[PDB]
Short mmCIF file of the C-alpha atoms (twelve columns), coordinates in Angstrom:
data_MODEL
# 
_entry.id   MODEL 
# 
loop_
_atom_site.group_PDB 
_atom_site.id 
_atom_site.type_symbol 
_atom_site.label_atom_id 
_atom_site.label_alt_id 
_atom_site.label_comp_id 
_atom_site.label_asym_id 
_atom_site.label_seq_id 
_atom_site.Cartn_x 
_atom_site.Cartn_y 
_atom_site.Cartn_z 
_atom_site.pdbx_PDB_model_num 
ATOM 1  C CA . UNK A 1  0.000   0.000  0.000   1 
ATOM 2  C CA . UNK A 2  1.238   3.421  -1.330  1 
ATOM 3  C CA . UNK A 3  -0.331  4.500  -3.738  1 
ATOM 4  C CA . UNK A 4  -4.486  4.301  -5.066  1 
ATOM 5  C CA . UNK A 5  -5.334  3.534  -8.841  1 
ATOM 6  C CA . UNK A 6  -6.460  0.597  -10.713 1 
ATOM 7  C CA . UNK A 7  -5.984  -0.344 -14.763 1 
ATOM 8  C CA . UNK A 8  -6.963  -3.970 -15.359 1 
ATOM 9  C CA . UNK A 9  -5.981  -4.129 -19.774 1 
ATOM 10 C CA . UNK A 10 -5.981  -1.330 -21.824 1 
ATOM 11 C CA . UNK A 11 -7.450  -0.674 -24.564 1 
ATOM 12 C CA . UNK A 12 -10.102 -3.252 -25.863 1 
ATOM 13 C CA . UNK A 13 -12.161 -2.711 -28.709 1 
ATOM 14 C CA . UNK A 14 -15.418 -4.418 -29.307 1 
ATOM 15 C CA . UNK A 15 -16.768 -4.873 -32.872 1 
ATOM 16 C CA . UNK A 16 -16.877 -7.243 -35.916 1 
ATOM 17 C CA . UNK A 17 -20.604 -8.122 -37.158 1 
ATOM 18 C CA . UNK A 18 -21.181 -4.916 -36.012 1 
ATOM 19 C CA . UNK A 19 -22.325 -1.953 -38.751 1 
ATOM 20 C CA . UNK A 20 -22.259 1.572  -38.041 1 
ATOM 21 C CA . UNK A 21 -26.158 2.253  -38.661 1 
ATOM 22 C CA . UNK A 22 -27.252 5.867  -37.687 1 
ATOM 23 C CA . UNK A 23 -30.727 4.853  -37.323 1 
ATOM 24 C CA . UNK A 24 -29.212 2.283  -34.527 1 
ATOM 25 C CA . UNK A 25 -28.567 4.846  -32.255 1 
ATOM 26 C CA . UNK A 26 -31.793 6.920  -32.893 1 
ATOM 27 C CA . UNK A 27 -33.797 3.984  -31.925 1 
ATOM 28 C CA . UNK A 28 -32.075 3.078  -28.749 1 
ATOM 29 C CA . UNK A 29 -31.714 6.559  -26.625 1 
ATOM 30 C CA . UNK A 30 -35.059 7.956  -28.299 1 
ATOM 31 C CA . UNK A 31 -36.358 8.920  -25.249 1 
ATOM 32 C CA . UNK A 32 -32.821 10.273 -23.993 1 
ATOM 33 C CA . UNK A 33 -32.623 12.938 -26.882 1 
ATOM 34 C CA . UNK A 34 -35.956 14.191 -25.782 1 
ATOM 35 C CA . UNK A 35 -35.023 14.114 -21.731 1 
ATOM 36 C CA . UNK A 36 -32.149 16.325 -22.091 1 
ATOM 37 C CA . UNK A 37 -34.444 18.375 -24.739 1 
ATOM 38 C CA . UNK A 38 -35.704 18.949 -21.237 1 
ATOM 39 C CA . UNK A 39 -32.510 18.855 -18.796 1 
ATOM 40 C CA . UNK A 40 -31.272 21.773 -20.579 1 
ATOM 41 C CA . UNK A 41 -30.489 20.598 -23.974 1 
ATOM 42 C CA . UNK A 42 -32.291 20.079 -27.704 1 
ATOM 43 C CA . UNK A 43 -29.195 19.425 -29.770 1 
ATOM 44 C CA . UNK A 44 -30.619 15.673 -29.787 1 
ATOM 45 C CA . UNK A 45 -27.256 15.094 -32.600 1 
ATOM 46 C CA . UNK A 46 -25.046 16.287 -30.180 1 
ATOM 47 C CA . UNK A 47 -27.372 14.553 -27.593 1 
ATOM 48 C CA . UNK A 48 -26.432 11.446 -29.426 1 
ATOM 49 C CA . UNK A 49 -22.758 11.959 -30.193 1 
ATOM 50 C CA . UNK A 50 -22.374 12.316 -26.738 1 
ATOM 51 C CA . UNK A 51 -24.603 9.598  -25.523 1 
ATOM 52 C CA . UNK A 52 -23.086 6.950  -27.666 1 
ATOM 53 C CA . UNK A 53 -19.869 8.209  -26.357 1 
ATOM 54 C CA . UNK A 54 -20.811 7.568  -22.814 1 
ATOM 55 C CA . UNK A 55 -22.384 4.269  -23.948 1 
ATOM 56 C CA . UNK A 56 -26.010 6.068  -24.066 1 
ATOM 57 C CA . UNK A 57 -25.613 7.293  -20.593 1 
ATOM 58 C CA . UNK A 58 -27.601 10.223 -20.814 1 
ATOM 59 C CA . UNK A 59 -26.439 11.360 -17.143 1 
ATOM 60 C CA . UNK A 60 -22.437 10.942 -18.562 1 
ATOM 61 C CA . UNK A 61 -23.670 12.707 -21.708 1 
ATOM 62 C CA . UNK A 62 -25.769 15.595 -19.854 1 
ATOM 63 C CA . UNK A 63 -22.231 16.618 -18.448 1 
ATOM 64 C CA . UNK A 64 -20.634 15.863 -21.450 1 
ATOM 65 C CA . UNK A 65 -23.183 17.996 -23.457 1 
ATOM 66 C CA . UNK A 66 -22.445 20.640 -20.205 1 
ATOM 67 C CA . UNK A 67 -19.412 21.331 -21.990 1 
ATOM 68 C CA . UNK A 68 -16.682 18.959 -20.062 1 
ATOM 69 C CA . UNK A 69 -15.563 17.500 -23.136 1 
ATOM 70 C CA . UNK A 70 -11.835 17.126 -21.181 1 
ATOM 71 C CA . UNK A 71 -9.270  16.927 -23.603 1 
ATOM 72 C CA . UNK A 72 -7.870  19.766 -25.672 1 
ATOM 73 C CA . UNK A 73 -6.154  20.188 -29.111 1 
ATOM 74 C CA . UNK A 74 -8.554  21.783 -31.874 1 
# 
């Protein structure tokens, strides 16, 4: 005991038979686009890009679509 932080892998991508289908993602958070139309949001896109980044978390994509995207280049 010294120090506090955990890894277990890196890095592990998980597709194959998998397609990218936009209307598979408009289908599956439906109702998520229209919450955060209500949390404070209506960018239902962005809604999306965000939610499928955080797995279709809506509550990791609300503070993702807060603006704490985290990393920084351009």
């Amino acid at each position: 005991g010294s120090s506090g932080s955990s890894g277990a892998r890196a890095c592990s991508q998980s597709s194959q038979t998998a397609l990218p289908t936009s209307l598979f993602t408009e289908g599956r958070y439906q109702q998520e686009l229209e919450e955060l139309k209500a949390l404070g949001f209506a960018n239902r896109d962005a809604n999306l890009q965000a939610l499928v980044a955080t797995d279709g978390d809506i509550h990791a994509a609300i503070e993702m679509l807060l603006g704490a995207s985290g990393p920084s280049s351009g």
